[model samples]
Target: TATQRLKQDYLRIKKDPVPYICAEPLPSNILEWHYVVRGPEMTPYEGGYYHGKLIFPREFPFKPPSIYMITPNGRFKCNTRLCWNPAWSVSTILTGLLSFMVEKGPTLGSIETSDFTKRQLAVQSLAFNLKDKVFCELFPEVVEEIK
Candidate 1:
C-alpha cells in the first residue's frame, strides 16, 4: 500500500537525510508533507529558505505527487501545482526544485525580478515559513537555524 511505502521511505529519509532539505509528514496525514530547503551557497537563493508541500495520492509511487511552493522565491509560482514524475523521490524533488530555480532562467510562470530582489525574497521567505503553523511544528530546528 502507498501508506506502507511512505512509512518505509520516511524511515529511510530519516536515517539518511537529504542535504539542505528537511521534510516531514503531517501528524495526522502521512500522505501530506511539508518541506524546507536551505538555499545552496553561491546561488542567488543563498542565505534564503524555501518552503513547499508535497501531496501524495493514494496511488503514489505509481503516480507522481503534486508539488506546491509556499514561499515566493521569484522562481516557481507560489501555490501552483508543478510538474512531477513518478520516478522522482523526495530527494530528487528537492534537488529538482533547487535546480529549476538556479538553472532555468526566469520564465513567464516566474515573476520578473533582479537577482538582488530575489535574494531579498528568499530571506523573507524564511520568516514567512516560520510563521506558518505546519512549518513551525514540523521544522522547528529549521526555524531556529534560519533565525
Candidate 2:
C-alpha cells in the first residue's frame, strides 16, 4: 500500500534524520510532505532554513512526486521539474536536493542571484516560513531552533 510504504519511509527518516535537512508529512495527509534545510555551511545560504514541499502521486515510488520550493533563496524558479530523480526516498531526495541547491548551474529552472542577495534571503528565510501555519505544525524542532 502507498500509505504503508510511506509510513515505513517516515520511520526510517525519523530514526536517522538527514543531516542539514528535516522533513515531515502533513498531520492528515501522508502523500503531502514538507522539508526544511539548514543552509549548508560555507555557502551563501548558511544560517538560513529553507522550506520546500513534495506532493506524491498515489502510485509513487513507482512514480516520482512533484517538487516545489517554498522559500526564496536566490535559487531555482520555485522548483526542479522532471521524473525528478531515481535515487528517491524521503532521505535521498532531500539530501540530493540540498546537494544541487548549493552548487552553481542554471541550465534549467534555476534563478541566479549574488552571494550578497542570497545571503540576504538566507537570513530572511526564517520569517517567511514561520508565516505558514502548516510549517509551524510540521517542524517544531525548527521552531525550537529559531528560538
Highest-scoring model, lDDT: 2
- After superposition, the stretches of candidate 2 with alpha carbons farther than 4 Å from their true spots are 79-87
Model 1, range 32-120, lDDT digits (tens) per residue? 98888888899888988888899989998888778888888877789988753565676677677667777757543565667888788
What lDDT tens digits, residue by residue, belong to model 2 across residues 1-147? Answer: 667778888999999888898888887899989889899889999989888888888987777777778888898666565224533677988887788888886545688889999999988988888887878888888988975
Q: Give per-model TM-scores.
A: 0.89, 0.90
Best by TM-score: 2
- Model 2 clash pairs are none
RMSD in order of candidates:
2.1, 2.1
Q: In candidate 1, what residue range of length 10 has the lowest lDDT sum?
A: 104-113
Each prediction's whole-model lDDT (CA): 0.80, 0.82
